[PDB]
């Protein structure tokens, strides 16, 4: 089963969140997954260079390739 919008994922296997976006962007080619993280340990608010892909609180958003996502937790932060 492939990834779908709304699914519980772990970015790089350690940062928990939900997929809010799955598609093409203006910042880079190919398919990108836009995730709203549980905590503000991300890089954006769902927008990049003024273009909005999804909406979340500042630094709770992050974009990654779908293959870097895991459905369950996989193993310098206190």
Swiss-Prot record:
PTM statement from Swiss-Prot or TrEMBL: Phosphorylated. Phosphorylation induces conformational changes by increasing the affinity of the N-terminus for C-terminus, resulting in inhibition of its function thus decreasing its binding to microtubules and DCTN1. Exhibits a folded, autoinhibited conformation when phosphorylated and an open conformation when dephosphorylated with increased binding affinity to microtubules and DCTN1. Phosphorylation regulates its recruitment to tyrosinated microtubules and the recruitment of vesicular cargo to microtubules in neurons.
Protein localization: Cytoplasm; Cytoplasm, Cytoskeleton; Cytoplasmic vesicle membrane; Cell projection, Ruffle
Residues the record lists as Phosphothreonine modifications: 77
Region described as Important for tubulin binding: spans on this chain: 42-46
Expressed in which tissues: Detected in dendritic cells (at protein level). Highly expressed in the Reed-Sternberg cells of Hodgkin disease.
Ranges of residues in domain CAP-Gly: 23-65
Subunit-structure text: Interacts with MTOR; phosphorylates and regulates CLIP1. Interacts (via CAP-Gly domains) with tubulin. Interacts with SLAIN2. Interacts (via zinc finger) with DCTN1. Interacts with TUBA1B, MAPRE1 and MAPRE3. Binds preferentially to tyrosinated microtubules, and only marginally to detyrosinated microtubules.
Domain remark text: Intramolecular interaction between the zinc finger domain and the CAP-Gly domains may inhibit interaction with tubulin.
Biological function: Binds to the plus end of microtubules and regulates the dynamics of the microtubule cytoskeleton. Promotes microtubule growth and microtubule bundling. Links cytoplasmic vesicles to microtubules and thereby plays an important role in intracellular vesicle trafficking. Plays a role macropinocytosis and endosome trafficking.
Name of protein: CAP-Gly domain-containing linker protein 1
Gene: CLIP1
Part of the whole protein covered: 56 to 141 of 1438
């Amino acid at each position: 089963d492939d990834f779908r919008v709304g699914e519980r994922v772990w970015v790089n296997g350690n940062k928990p969140g939900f997929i809010q976006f799955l598609g093409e962007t203006q910042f880079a080619p190919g398919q990108w997954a836009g995730i709203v993280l549980d905590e503000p340990i991300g890089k954006n608010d769902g927008s990049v260079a003024g273009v909005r892909y999804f909406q979340c609180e500042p630094l709770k958003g992050i974009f990654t390739r779908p293959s870097k996502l895991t459905r369950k937790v996989q193993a310098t932060t206190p």
